[model samples]
Target: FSSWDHLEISTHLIRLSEKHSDLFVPSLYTPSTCFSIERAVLKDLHLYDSSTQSVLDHPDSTQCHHQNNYQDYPHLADRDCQNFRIYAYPLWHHPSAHNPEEMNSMMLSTAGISHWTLVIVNLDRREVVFFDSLANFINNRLIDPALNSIATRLGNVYPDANGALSPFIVKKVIKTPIQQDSTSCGIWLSLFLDKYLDNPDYVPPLMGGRQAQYFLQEFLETIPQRPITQASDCTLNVLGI
Candidate 1:
């Protein structure tokens, strides 16, 4: 549940990438890129829901098939048993069909993307229906020009004071802006450093102290002049500690 946003965004990006192959730019996994993708996903979902509410509301719609009282849905009873029961099924009845060769071919042809491949078959009835990987479908279609534009804007705005591409001011003049407190951000930096220090698994240097100092310097430099501070207990307490 905590990771739903990222998962959803990734699914949408994949779909967009597939659709606009010529214009789609592969994004490097970065913090700014992640945030941009989140915005893009939300924007796309808004449009999609607006356009397909009726289709989405259909009783047999695969997209809206959230498992609710599956026992009442007789067709899914055996499937439910398989989902929960570890020792119920015997091997060779339906062996794992993870064909690396086919997967490799598909990925090569379509830029390393193919999740819906498994097809359950009944020998008696010569019928075949593709078991859909809807999640994969979403991912493949949501990262094209429509989505990557956000990422490109983020890349352009990253060095700016507000870190926003649009000309509009991010914050209002009269209202106090909500922001991450420097103290808490520093504490988070410490924790981030501790997690990565001397751990080979985590790539790149844990330059927490330097990064924090740099960020502070950049933030202060953005101001035209020195900011006024009261010599009260609160200000004194912050400096003293």
Candidate 2:
């Protein structure tokens, strides 16, 4: 473990946060890393204003479903929510993190959610794609409401001028990759954000435990080479990530 204690992405090290450390080491923990990667993807999208026009992807899709995260802002829904043609939200939900009553209705009898799932909303396709790594057999028992939870909240912030939540169907991506162990969901999803932005219909590559680390490492090494333009003027926090 000592050898894995330190990691570097670009020139900076990964020791700024424990979450980043655990993720790069590929261990039994997870979010700063994912958040960092999310920023990177967002920065790339900003680099090319064209995709924004043609691609219309939102890198930091809000976690509107989670009441706590959503409630923090007093009706503070960024116009980003409605403006995007496609939105990818990486949700890290643990039963411990959510209040009992809040998610119990969405819960399944057999499982407690300790995994990460990706929510993708495509306006053009009129669909909401749920990308889950666990692929649990009875996922919809919880997934349906997990999605509906956001659908309700999304309607709140994304209402049109007359205040209407756009109509869209919910669907799951079966063609995407799955994980053999739990630790990799966040990592897989962070990478998926980048790929998804590149192609709205993007599907993630398969990940075994070791391969997950390799994939993350592979992306890490290339961070310095990723998109950036002074004209686009992305936030410093995102660039630092």
Candidate 3:
């Protein structure tokens, strides 16, 4: 059992930590990157911010037009949208450094890494989204063929002969969800804070410990161009990829 009203969001994380010996509590300050189908539903209902009004469309509506009709749909609103999903990956900090050795050569930290990716489903629409990982945007964001070509030219090697790029990819892709699990709340939170929250020092108030913090710092250093680069051609073309 756990605190429902007080730490509603964190309790699920605590449960995950209990189930997995390697898992640890994540920071709430970190942006949750795991796609949350339930969160999309809740976002539709404006749960995070009391000021923001929920969209009028039923939770089943796929179209994301933000409105609120909780009074008319109390039953849907009451449902707990928590799923005990957890995603994990070998801890990495820098995107520029291909291997951990290269990353570690520059910095200082312990050898092993620990993290988890958790998600919840919106049952009505049957859509599964990551709750505390970056998988959501990585899946949704359009990676251009031109960029792919550039990526290849830039010495970005393709997955090995077995088509395996990383350990996390190999393990999670074989599971039920075939998508790449670049799901980390720490990564998501940093992006969110750097952009929306405007807090450069912001770490996930929940799980970003020393190692996670170092990981975030190095991660940001490599992807500093993402905010601008990801939008440049795609947004300008109006092709809406």
Candidate 4:
């Protein structure tokens, strides 16, 4: 299952761009629930060419590609660099939700049980930036192979000079302050993407417990037709005030 609130926040951000296209061109969002190699590759292809076939329209083909496990690299040459940015994923203690049974039995620690992080890929600069709200709790090593795999797939699409695959400069954005509590990591991740989409260079504020609660409340209230509102008394307790 997926978090509806997280998905709503992301959807709302995308809708904001739609309402004001002049202010936010090329704004988009990919749900964490559908985060997969096939989806990513298809989206990349569609970004490069609007007429490209959608993975959804051809589930059999998509499944075949997924089964192949990113072994066959697709041609993504001469694609627009501006399209690559803000890949979001829900971080659970285990690996892929489809294969939860495969998780190691011995790893009993509750560290990073449920979290969220953003992966920023700047194709123009050949850089991959990881933004984690709980940086210390995350296992940086777990992300290494995924980053390399994406780099490898995309590098083949856009190779460097000497005809060799170009390597992406990996970076961890440590300057952005971490979340104060476990539950707020997802909120912070959404806020991080919202701020970055508005202004790529802007650093998010150092948000703690109360600040996160307030921000979340304000954000939900701002969305059109959403039932969220200012909490009081018993409502405050219900809203996790």
Candidate 5:
């Protein structure tokens, strides 16, 4: 029963919210048909705005660079900045797979046949958390190495000012219920991010597939429609209209 129209409506809500608030940046939602290192890097830049304009505008097509760090200037470290960045993938690509020689070559070629997952970096907490709706898909061997690669990139950008490279604790979300349909994984991932960002510690109530769809329908109906300026002009309480 799930469809891309449903997914696009959900994404529109997020973008609207980002337009209304300074604290919430609109998350990038890539369709199931597309995946690339360049898109991932741009999504990261959109989350953490670095001082280097060229890097943001013309990101290297072949590589993700260290220049994409948070709080690049020393003086701004103490100032309150957006603390969370979320990247959603139509399929989880192993960090080691920059070349064609790596594992899961078929996953790179066929997009929708794979699963969707999220990489949430909570800079405020110094943690990188992965959320996969299905427990069977959780692979520490694959995830750990991918996280290390992420840590190195984040470390380069937001290195601990104290000279010690702050360690980002890696966590896998295990308690969330699994989805029954392959098509619903992306929808569930979107809902999961919305709920998590709304209340990081609060667990969502039990929701079956139908319940999830209804919730998304309600969200589209309830969120206010208003024009938003580019600068930080609007004030929206976290998770509030």
Candidate 6:
């Protein structure tokens, strides 16, 4: 007795990446593919259900007639910073698709940002960590814009002891398991984000491209089957129903 419709899920995944066979192969995962993984992992941690202390659930929710601009920054910042717990955002280099009202899904093909990086911020601890597999060679040029904006936004909202605005705080990109190939960063990010929830400081085993392929296979096999009918019509674009 599965809780989800296996056929419906198989079809919905095609919209997420490209096709059902995409999951069967070790291919470059699309931006939405990475976001799909991040959404599932966040739910796995049960952050969606907690009260004020819970990690916010903005991604993968029902389309709200607006771009998912809330993923990186939102009205939650208006609340007491002391009460929130954690925040996670899947950073897509395509800033326009990310925050603009003209949001569009840039497929892995060529229309949008092809890279994915996971950013985890501990509101309570006041620390941000970037789990990028390319942390060694590449700088955070694409990721920093969002990081800086969030830092500035958070700083503006949070007041210090003297009733003064706090200093801008941003993320510190840490050296993580760097993948040797270009095609596997999506899987690396998915693995990094999922594992980090168990232990923030946990270091994942060094892996090559194949490990990511196998990891995706295992994830597919282990996902809880829920009762889902019809396809997922969730869109993050600026113009849509």
RMSD of each: 23.7, 12.6, 20.4, 11.1, 9.4, 12.4
The sequence of per-residue lDDT tens digits that candidate 3 reaches over residues 127-195 is 222322333223223112212322232121223345543211211111222222233443443233233
Candidate 5, which ten residues in sequence have the lowest lDDT sum? 231-240
Candidate with best lDDT: 5
The number of residue pairs in model 4 that clash at the backbone is: 0
Q: Candidate 1, residues 12-127: lDDT per residue as tens digits?
A: 22222233222111121211121133332222222113345421211232332213423222222223221210010000100122343443344335321222211111111111
Per-residue accuracy of model 4 over 32-136 as CA lDDT, tens digit each: 221343235435334322335432322232233212121111111222323434443333333443332333231222323545565655555555556677664
Minimum summed lDDT over a 10-residue window in model 3 is located at 166-175
Candidate 5 per-residue lDDT, tens place, 76-117, comes to: 123223333443333344443544344346454543345666
Instruction: Report lDDT (CA) for all predictions.
Output: 0.24, 0.41, 0.29, 0.45, 0.46, 0.41
lDDT of 3 at 6: 12
The residue ranges of model 4 lying beyond 4 angstroms of the native Cα positions read 1-6, 16-113, 159-164, 175-177, 207-241
Highest TM-score against the true fold, candidate: 5
Please, what is the TM-score per model?
0.16, 0.46, 0.20, 0.52, 0.53, 0.45
Ranking by lDDT: 5, 4, 6, 2, 3, 1
Superposed Cα deviation of residue 74, candidate 2 (Å): 14
lDDT for residue 59 in candidate 5, whole number 0-100: 27
Expressed as tens digits, the lDDT of each residue in 97-203 for candidate 2 is 24444433333321123355666655455456677666542245445665654444444334545556653455666544466554555555555655655566777
Candidate 3 residues lying further than 4 Å off, grouped into runs, are 1-212, 229-241
Candidate 6 lDDT over 124-158, as tens digits, reads: 44455666666643344434555554454444444
**How accurate locally is residue 152 in candidate 1, as Cα lDDT from 0 to 100?**
38
Give me the displacement of residue 180 in model 6, in angstroms.
3.1
